[PDB]
Design an enzyme around this catalytic site. Structure first.
Site, PDB file in Angstrom:
ATOM      1  NE  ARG A 253      -4.100   1.855   2.207  1.00 41.12           N
ATOM      2  CZ  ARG A 253      -4.155   2.724   3.232  1.00 41.12           C
ATOM      3  NH1 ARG A 253      -3.319   2.636   4.243  1.00 41.12           N
ATOM      4  NH2 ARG A 253      -4.988   3.716   3.211  1.00 41.12           N
TER       5      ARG A 253
ATOM      6  CG  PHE B  79      -1.872   9.363   4.019  1.00 38.36           C
ATOM      7  CD1 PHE B  79      -1.866  10.123   5.195  1.00 38.36           C
ATOM      8  CD2 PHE B  79      -2.565   8.144   3.935  1.00 38.36           C
ATOM      9  CE1 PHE B  79      -2.624   9.564   6.252  1.00 38.36           C
ATOM     10  CE2 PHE B  79      -3.207   7.532   5.006  1.00 38.36           C
ATOM     11  CZ  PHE B  79      -3.216   8.299   6.188  1.00 38.36           C
TER      12      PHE B  79
ATOM     13  CD  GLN C 100      -0.812  -0.251   5.079  1.00 38.66           C
ATOM     14  OE1 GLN C 100      -1.353   0.809   5.147  1.00 38.66           O
ATOM     15  NE2 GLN C 100      -1.519  -1.389   5.429  1.00 38.66           N
TER      16      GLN C 100
ATOM     17  CG  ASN D 219      -3.847  -0.036  14.347  1.00 39.35           C
ATOM     18  OD1 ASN D 219      -4.775   0.584  13.698  1.00 39.35           O
ATOM     19  ND2 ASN D 219      -3.091   0.571  15.243  1.00 39.35           N
TER      20      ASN D 219
ATOM     21  CG  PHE E 140       1.483   4.005   8.436  1.00 39.66           C
ATOM     22  CD1 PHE E 140       0.773   3.279   9.395  1.00 39.66           C
ATOM     23  CD2 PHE E 140       1.808   5.316   8.664  1.00 39.66           C
ATOM     24  CE1 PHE E 140       0.250   3.934  10.479  1.00 39.66           C
ATOM     25  CE2 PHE E 140       1.294   5.997   9.816  1.00 39.66           C
ATOM     26  CZ  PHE E 140       0.540   5.305  10.736  1.00 39.66           C
TER      27      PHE E 140
ATOM     28  CG  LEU F 286      -2.608   8.777  10.896  1.00 37.91           C
ATOM     29  CD1 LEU F 286      -1.547   7.995  10.144  1.00 37.91           C
ATOM     30  CD2 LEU F 286      -4.058   8.287  10.595  1.00 37.91           C
TER      31      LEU F 286
ATOM     32  CG  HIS G 263      -2.436   4.078  13.222  1.00 37.06           C
ATOM     33  ND1 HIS G 263      -2.843   2.878  12.684  1.00 37.06           N
ATOM     34  CD2 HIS G 263      -3.414   5.008  12.917  1.00 37.06           C
ATOM     35  CE1 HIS G 263      -4.026   3.116  12.103  1.00 37.06           C
ATOM     36  NE2 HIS G 263      -4.403   4.370  12.163  1.00 37.06           N
TER      37      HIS G 263
END
Lengths: 164, 218, 218
Positions: free
Chosen positions: A54, A59, A62, A101, A112, A121, A125
Site C-alpha cells: 500500500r 500520506f 505501508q 492496524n 506505515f 493518526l 496508531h
C-alpha cells in the site's frame, strides 16, 4: 540502547537504495522489539522479501504483510496481534514510523512510513520509531504508489537486519 | 434519506415524522403480519442506518418482538464482520474505511460516514444491506406468530372452496417455504386435504386445472 | 521464609505449618488483643510477601477483619504508587525493575522477584514494608475490637487503685494517641479521673514519689 535496523529496497528486482530506522524502545518496548526481531528474522519469520502492498503519495508507505501480501496478513513475534502499547509519541512529520492496524488491538507486523505530517493518526496508531537515514529512498518508493494504495511496481524488502 | 434522485445530486434530509406516524400505526393496526414488510420497504427509500434505527426506536410497542429482532439483526451484523476482514492501516484524506457489522447497524458509525459509503462511486449501499438484515428478522418474527401449520390445512364441512383457497393461500403467504414446495403443495395437498364432495368435483375437473376453473365450480 | 544460618545472600525455605497453626490459634483464643502485634511479629520475621499472603489467607474465620486489613494494604499500596513516578523502558545492565504497590503486596510480583530485590544492593525490604502495611492495619483493628475508650474511664469511689490502673493501662495500650499526650494523660489525666479520696492521698504523697509507691496509696 536499541540498535538501528535497516531495510534494503529493491524495485522490480533492481535495487533502489537503503532505509535506516531508529526505534523508541524506551517508550514502547514490545512494539519496538517486534519490528526489530522481524527485521533480523531470528524467530524464523519476518520482513525479508515481502512486498510494500500500500503506497500513497504525500500520506504514507505501508508494508510488513509477509503472509498474504495484501494488507490482511502479518503476525507479531508473540503470535497473533498485540494491544496498543503507548500512544505518547506524536506523528510529528515525515519519516515517522508507526503501526498499521484495523482498529483497536490489532498490531501484528504491518507498519506505515509517514511522508507528510498526519496529526489525525495520533491516538490511533502507535508511533514507534523514526527514520535515521534513507528517507529520500522512501521519497523514491512513494513514486511507485497511486491514490488508492495500488502499487504500479513490485516494491520489495530485499534484505533486512540490525546494525552495530 | 437520500432525497430527489438517488443518482442525482445526492441531497439528504431526515426521516419524516409523516413516515413515522404511518410506520407506528401499521404495527399497531396489523401486528407481525407479512403485509408490514413491503410497507417497510416502500417507506425506507434511500434511508441511512441512522433513519432505520429511528424507525425501530420510535415504535414503543412490541418489546419482546423488537428484542428478538435486534438479536436476529446482530447475528447478521456478526456474520458481515466475520466474512469481511478490514484491510489494515490508516485512512487517506478524501477516502473512507471498509464497513463492519456494527457500522451498518449504525452503532460504531455516524451519518457523515454512512452518507460517504452510500454516495461514493460506485455507491456502497449500507442502508439496503441493513434494511435486508431487518427484513430477515421480520420474516422470523412473522413466522413465529404465523397462523398454524400448512400441512394441517383441511377444508371444513360448512366451508366453500373459495374460503378454503383463501385460507390455504393466507397460510402460504406467512409460510416461508420454497416456491417450488408451495407450487407442489398448491397442486397436490390442496386437493388431498379437501372435503370428499368438494374433492370429487375438484378431481372431476381433472389434473392440472386453473384456479379459476376450480373456483368456478366446487 | 528466608534462612538465617546461610552466610550467602538469600537462601529460602517453604513456610512452616507450626507457624501458621499458632497464628490461627492466637487469632482464635486472643480475639485481636493488642498482644497479637508482637506475637505476629515473632512469627513473620524472615518472611516474604508470598509467605505473608499465605498467612493472611490461611485465616478462615474473621472475614470482616481480613477484608478491613486488605483495605488498609490497598490504601497504602495506592499511596505507594501515587508517590513514585516508576520507569517503563528496558532496564540497563546489572540492575532491576523497581517495585510497585502490587509488587510489595505480592499480587503482580512472583517469589523469584521478591527474592531479587532483597538480594540486591541497596536491598529494597519488601517483606518489612508489606508487613508495615499489615501492622498499620492491625493497629486499627485492635482498637476497634477493644470496647473501652480512654476518657470514659473514671475510678469508682470504692474501687482499688491497682484495679483502676490495670484497666486504665489496658485502655490506653489499645488507643492510638501521640506520645506527648500519653505522657500528659499518665501525669495529670489519670490522677484527675481518680476518686477524690484517693486523689486526696495521691496529692498528699506528691508527684516526687516512685510509681511503686503510687500503686500502694489509696
Amino acid at each position: 540502547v536499541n540498535p538501528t535496523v535497516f531495510f534494503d529496497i529493491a524495485v522490480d528486482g533492481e535495487p533502489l537504495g537503503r532505509v535506516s530506522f531508529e526505534l523508541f524502545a524506551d517508550k514502547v518496548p514490545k512494539t519496538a522489539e517486534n519490528f526489530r526481531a522481524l527485521s533480523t528474522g531470528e524467530k524464523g519469520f519476518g520482513y525479508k522479501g515481502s512486498c510494500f502492498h500500500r503506497i500513497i503519495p504525500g500520506f504514507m508507505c505501508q508494508g510488513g504483510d509477509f503472509t498474504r501480501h495484501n494488507g490482511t496478513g502479518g503476525k507479531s513475534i508473540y503470535g497473533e496481534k498485540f494491544e496498543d502499547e503507548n500512544f505518547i509519541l506524536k506523528h510529528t512529520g515525515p519519516g515517522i514510523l508507526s503501526m498499521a492496524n484495523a482498529g483497536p488491538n490489532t498490531n501484528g507486523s504491518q507498519f506505515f512510513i509517514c511522508t507528510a505530517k498526519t496529526e489525525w493518526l495520533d491516538g490511533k496508531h502507535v508511533v514507534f520509531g523514526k527514520v535515521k537515514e534513507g528517507m529520500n529512498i522512501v521519497e523514491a518508493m512513494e513514486r511507485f504508489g497511486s491514490r488508492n494504495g495500488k502499487t504500479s511496481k513490485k516494491i520489495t524488502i530485499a534484505d533486512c537486519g540490525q546494525l552495530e | 434519506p437520500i432525497v430527489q434522485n438517488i443518482q442525482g445530486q445526492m441531497v439528504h434530509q431526515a426521516i419524516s415524522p409523516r413516515t413515522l406516524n404511518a410506520w407506528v400505526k401499521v404495527v399497531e393496526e396489523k401486528a407481525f403480519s407479512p403485509e408490514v414488510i413491503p410497507m417497510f420497504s416502500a417507506l425506507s427509500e434511500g434511508a441511512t442506518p441512522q433513519d432505520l434505527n429511528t424507525m425501530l426506536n420510535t415504535v414503543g410497542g412490541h418489546q419482546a418482538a423488537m428484542q428478538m429482532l435486534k438479536e436476529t439483526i446482530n447475528e447478521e451484523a456478526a456474520e458481515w464482520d466475520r466474512v469481511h476482514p478490514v484491510h489494515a492501516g490508516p485512512i487517506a484524506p478524501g477516502q473512507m474505511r471498509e464497513p463492519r457489522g456494527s457500522d451498518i447497524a449504525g452503532t460504531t458509525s455516524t451519518l457523515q460516514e454512512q452518507i460517504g459509503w452510500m454516495t461514493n462511486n460506485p455507491p456502497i449501499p449500507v442502508g439496503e444491506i441493513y434494511k435486508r438484515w431487518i427484513i430477515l428478522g421480520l420474516n422470523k418474527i412473522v413466522r413465529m406468530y404465523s397462523p398454524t401449520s400448512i400441512l394441517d390445512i383441511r377444508q371444513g364441512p360448512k366451508e366453500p372452496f373459495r374460503d378454503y383457497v383463501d385460507r390455504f393461500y393466507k397460510t402460504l403467504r406467512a409460510e416461508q417455504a420454497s416456491q417450488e414446495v408451495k407450487n407442489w403443495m398448491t397442486e397436490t395437498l390442496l386437493v388431498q386435504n379437501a372435503n370428499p364432495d368438494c374433492k370429487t368435483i375438484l378431481k372431476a375437473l381433472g389434473p392440472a386445472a386453473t384456479l379459476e376453473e376450480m373456483m368456478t365450480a366446487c
